[PDB]
């Protein structure tokens, strides 16, 4: 958090600096190296802001197996919709040409065809469907708690 007497003369650390105290993106960055793991982190971190405490509650929401809030933290391997319709590869461009994708929203983990919520749609984790008629649709993922 940048709060002592000479903390920044030391090697940045993730537990100390961000998981034990709140942090700036620069502090996380400084403790990660890869900008890529920082994008990944910062994303699953900012989405867990309302689950800081307890910290077992923080470890839950950062793990991504449960949707917390609107499920922007969700990083699970569920890929079928609310209706049962399978999801379109995020990287596929057919049947629907996704406007949301890895270059656009790099912290999210648009892998395979797994439900996500890169955007924080109020209906939660979604994905694009394979049905030509239904572009996107919410998915049923276990809620943090």
Instruction: Summarize as ranges the residues that interact with Ca ion (CB under 5 A).
Output: 1-2, 7-8, 12, 15, 17, 20-21, 26-27, 30
User: Do 141 and 57 form a contact (C-beta atoms < 8 A)?
Assistant: no
Q: How far is the CB of 50 from Ca ion (least distance, A)?
A: 20
Task: Return phi, psi of residue 138, to 5°.
Answer: -60, 150
Nearer to Ca ion, 9 or 122 (CB): 9
Alpha-carbon distance 70 to 124, whole Å?
5
Nearer to Ca ion, 27 or 138 (CB): 27
Nearer to Ca ion, 38 or 81 (CB): 38
Nearer to Ca ion, 31 or 78 (CB): 31
Q: How far is the CB of 68 from Ca ion (least distance, A)?
A: 21
Q: How far is the CB of 45 from Ca ion (least distance, A)?
A: 15
């Amino acid at each position: 958090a940048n709060k002592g007497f000479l903390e920044e003369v030391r090697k940045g650390n993730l537990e100390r600096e961000c998981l034990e105290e709140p942090c700036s993106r620069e502090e996380a960055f400084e403790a990660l190296e890869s900008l890529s793991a920082t994008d990944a982190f910062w994303a699953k971190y900012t989405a867990c802001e309302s689950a800081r405490n307890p910290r077992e509650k923080l470890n839950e929401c950062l793990e991504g197996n449960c949707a917390e809030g609107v499920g922007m933290n969700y990083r699970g391997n569920v890929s079928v919709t609310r209706s049962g319709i399978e999801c379109q590869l995020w990287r596929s461009r057919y049947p629907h040409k996704p406007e949301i994708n890895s270059t656009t929203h790099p912290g999210a983990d648009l892998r395979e065809n797994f439900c996500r919520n890169p955007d924080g749609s109020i209906t939660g984790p979604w994905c694009y469907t394979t049905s030509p008629t239904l572009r996107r649709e919410e998915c049923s993922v276990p809620v943090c708690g």
